[PDB]
Symmetry: D2
Subunit: 390 residues, 4 copies
């Protein structure tokens, strides 16, 4: 409400088989995510690419987890390859990682519970990158169901061509027609309705920077056409906020939350986009990529950097995420330790250990690595198994 479903309950009933399988984590996740998005000033989250990263995010009091397809491409995909962000990896990598994260969170819940603690809420909703769906609408249908099986709370889909898909901050992005992008959003809602789960659907547009379109088939896209075509037969279009706004407005009836990929953290741009959407869709949830490909200190003065998320929240950007935080934290911390260890050996490692001891003041516990991974929990299991007679 007011979401459009261009199909009937009977359509859903015919396609869902005779038995309904319960997806507890996906149901909890979507419920909690939807409450949070309507009750908080905003939700801020960071990219996680391992169960331990996502565990520390929750442990530090973040209320949501972001699963980045870019990070999956780089360091956590089922091909075990390092890829750039071009949908090169196996389409089940993302859902598999969402499962691993929920497994880590479930183990944390088990540790804290076995010690009589409930001070951390471990089951933070996961919002997951489905890219451009790894082909057509049936591929979208499958990745959506896989994410619900894995326990994702929300899933995002973008209007780039899957076969030539790119990082949101790479040149030469290719839009698919408006009607094709809406068909993907309908495929995603159909997958959620078939699984019987109120999963959040985020519609991303790449139309802010995208200067190429696959097909002139859709009347709604032709106004942006220049009349040039390329060797490949792509149509040249006028990228910018007018194209982004068009797509945003076309997708709003079919998605819970709208996201404009941005080439620069610009609050005036953000406000103009927000006001354009809310003019036709009052109160529509928006999402904002706080991109690590932005040089925050070079673009913004300290006051704006500190105010940025709060300002974005007041405009309607209720979900704000640093997509590549996990990559940067992982690569930075190992490089820095490695570079110092090369020269100074155990002095370099003692420096990290001392940083860990300092963070214990703020609830960090992984310095005590044996307890952190569940050694205490499995020792309680062993003792129950060994405990009673015969």
């Amino acid at each position: 409400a007011g979401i459009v479903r261009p199909y009937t309950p009977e359509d859903v009933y015919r396609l869902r088989g005779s038995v309904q399988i319960e997806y507890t984590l996906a149901r909890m996740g979507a419920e909690r995510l939807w409450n949070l998005l309507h009750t908080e000033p905003y939700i801020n989250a960071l990219g996680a690419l391992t169960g331990n990263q996502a565990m520390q995010q929750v442990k530090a009091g973040l209320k949501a987890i972001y699963l980045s397809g870019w990070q999956v491409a780089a360091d956590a995909n089922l091909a075990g390859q390092m890829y750039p962000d071009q949908s090169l990896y196996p389409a089940n990598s993302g859902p598999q990682l969402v499962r691993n994260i929920n497994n880590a969170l479930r183990r944390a819940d088990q540790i804290y519970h076995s010690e009589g603690r409930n001070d951390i809420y471990w089951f933070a909703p996961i919002v997951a990158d489905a890219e451009a769906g790894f082909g057509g609408p049936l591929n979208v249908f499958e990745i959506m169901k896989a994410y619900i099986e894995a326990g994702a709370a929300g899933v995002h889909f973008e209007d780039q061509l899957a076969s030539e898909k790119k990082c949101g901050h790479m040149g030469g992005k290719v839009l698919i027609p408006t009607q094709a992008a809406i068909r993907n959003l309908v495929a995603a809602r159909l997958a959620a309705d078939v699984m019987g789960v109120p999963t959040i659907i985020v519609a991303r547009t790449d139309a802010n920077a995208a200067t190429l379109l696959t097909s002139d088939i859709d009347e709604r896209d032709r106004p942006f056409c220049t009349g040039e075509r390329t060797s490949e037969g792509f149509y040249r279009v006028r990228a910018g906020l007018d194209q982004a706004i068009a797509r945003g407005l076309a997708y709003a009836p079919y998605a819970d939350m709208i996201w404009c990929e941005t080439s620069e953290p610009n609050l005036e741009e953000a406000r103009r986009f927000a006001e354009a959407i809310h003019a036709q869709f009052p109160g529509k949830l928006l999402a904002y990529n706080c991109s690590p490909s932005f040089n925050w200190k070079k673009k913004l003065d300290d006051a704006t950097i500190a105010a940025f998320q709060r300002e974005l929240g007041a405009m309607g950007y209720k979900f704000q995420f640093v997509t590549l935080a996990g990559f940067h934290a992982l690569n930075y911390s190992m490089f820095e330790l490695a570079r110092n260890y090369r020269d100074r050996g155990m002095a370099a490692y003692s420096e990290l250990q001392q940083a860990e001891f300092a963070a214990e003041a703020y609830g960090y516990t992984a310095t005590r690595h044996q307890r952190e991974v569940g050694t205490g929990y499995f020792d309680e299991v062993a003792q129950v198994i060994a405990g009673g007679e015969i």
Copy 2:
């Protein structure tokens, strides 16, 4: 030389099939590891649990990579679970991770090569944890071959019971008989000879702290027996450096390098162990776990912490590794960023970005994440594919 093989070339020929498959990375790795161990004062390395961690280790000038089974248990296993260090995860997890790491290193090599750079040697040898072999000698045979397939340079095996196996710093460790541990080392050399690769074999003993033994079957273990037995029927033994030394000496003919698990970074202990081994096996390679479960600054003054690895090198500890560096770096860096992001949003993230920019002075490049993951490399691929006519 002087390694003992209690079997013949004919035995190997009968078991190796009719075709010999080449394992380039495993052959390069074992060759380079063996040269390094004989030409350098020592090799120091850190635990890596992702391809990106291992890439930053090489990029910072570390000459070897350590694959920790503990880290696999925690955050990088094929069950996608968080486990403590009790051989709970699927036995192919470790070799799979070694493949992923070599894949990341291979992609780095491809990036640097496509830019006309050869200043980094990317194929750093990987020394991998095979635990207690995930069952009997045939399980040892399989994990050894899997590691060679994955491109490991060296593999370590310990004399704990696989079914009750534990972290080297957990209480209640259980030794298997000397003869059983030697049989595992023979299984590992047989696997390497069958694959036709000079893979390094490390024999770890847990006999420094282990107070329990499965069986009195071996004459060599009975001197350590007290005569007590437990409910489970384990034999109580006198743990300590005399037990560790016995096992070390029993394993030396069957392993390239010897490793005594230690409960404390103690140079006098280290020297006594080294001198005990070299008294019968002059020049025998040793390995030393620089354990993160040690409180380095609480146990050692700054001069000893700074000298520690250099001193250990001079005694014969030519391979020194911080087993859980990857876990600590990953958990610490995401907690710290998360805790600050919770309060201060993009100020917290700009602080990490600024740390990344500072590390560029020392060769860090992942701040430029697009190039780091191979966007330039795959854009050269796309251009060759698109480049010529028809």
Copy 3:
């Protein structure tokens, strides 16, 4: 009732975390399996090693599916290796295959449902081989939970040593002490209680043929000891029906159903075992391996072969399974087609096609391969997605 749990509800509550995840297929499976076992003369099933084998078993009217660890070892494990039956493969292979099978059954249910048919009940309970648990009781705890996650209805555990474990029809089998085997059965019930699912637990004994024991620790096993020990330090025991009966009776309080591995399909032996169990445990469910390693026509005359399962049912063997049916059907059918195709090309293939057309008389539909795999179902999905306007 009367099952023994040597632990409390409070023990279970402490170990199960704060949220209870629903396992619909595992709950349905255990419920349906338990009803069937108490209402039918008996249940007969065949080994399945692919989703399609299990689909044809259900389609032909078999009421249960058997997941063989032997078949997993041969042709369906996560190492992608051909293994003999010695617990050589990754411990998650079995549960993964149970998931794949339930996925195939779920797709069948979706096809038949989308066509307005409910004449096949697709969700046949799966009884799965957990071997000797892939190590100790904690490994048992993990494989039990993995099977419940995958949707198994029942799981079996045997009293062989995991590290030297063997095919039930291989020589030199090694029993673990009675107390150790009971501890594994307690670990399995604890895993099921923690997941909140009434999963069936089958206790297999290998004590009919097993002539070796790991430890004299248990008073209950010493009567079978000869007083000889081997090089490895195994104890020699008197294998036979008296040892099998002892173990069966020791395991009965801790398992729902008892299974004696047999070296020969002998109804008098079967009756003696049944009568021995029911003398202390009236009405106890039993299970019987109708082994394909038996030469049925060489051992039994036609009347006995035809009566065999019915006779076994009347004794209390309510679950009867041909463990390796899937292996034999798969290897036989491809060899036979291949051998004829080598000589006669498409004549050989037309002969198979004609056999398929003949089986359509009995409900076979896979000749129509396009519909069989869900082409119709996904074409209905595509049409709902494409169907409504904008």
Copy 4:
């Protein structure tokens, strides 16, 4: 020779990194496949979807193995789902299965070798389905390298749209422009040259039945255009042998072997296609799908069915394959056994066992299942490990 590469050795050198990894099975496979295709009247093969199916194919004297993407979709993909043939599964499924098959063949080689037999040549070349490449040319580049890593000898690529891709015998197939299909073939040769392996490349066209085209961009495709466009904006084209022939001729410089998907086993059609290709490309290798979706006995009289492959060989169809033999053999054999087992229990199973005993006359050995899976081989391994003193 005369293959066109629209790129230079320098292009390949820049993209291949600094170290060349050996792919023994892929090199052997491509070499043996290329010799066979030039020395034999023709090669006939069957679809295999497990290592055991492929082992029985080799054991029966077939000289090649076919890896079907359709069969992967149905019963052997990394999503563990039953899919129709629409590129729905994870793109690494096919290469993973090629690895499993080579693993089974390697184990067979090890068994026969350990017994002093070399009468079977186990390393039969595998020709593998890469579909339409699971996206764009970079996705093609990755699946080609993955197949070479897995040890495929040859790989096929078709000119259908990946996102709307379909079974070769499904209606509503969509061609991509000629230039796009050639770009995929260039991506595949670039991947093989980068890996340093002479892998066979097969170009399939779907233009015999395909009535839709994505784009009018290519001058070579416009002659087939009617001038109608659909809702989706696809161009209507005149399907048939003239379109198939055009594509075949466009692809011939860029592929080793050409394949026209056919809706019917018609020798006159086959001859016309062959003669059309050889008129411009004398001696060009062709491949022919002997489709199981054809009703062989309904379409052809017994003489033609028996002569069919021999006739096709003489025209230039040197590689002939029944794509779905594995699916039909697996589904048929389990249904038939299941249906009989439901009624007659062990009589039904004894009937299969008796069929197995009869096939032993022609070299079938899987009735002796213990030896078949390597129990003898691993018992020789155990004995070498246990054999020598200390």
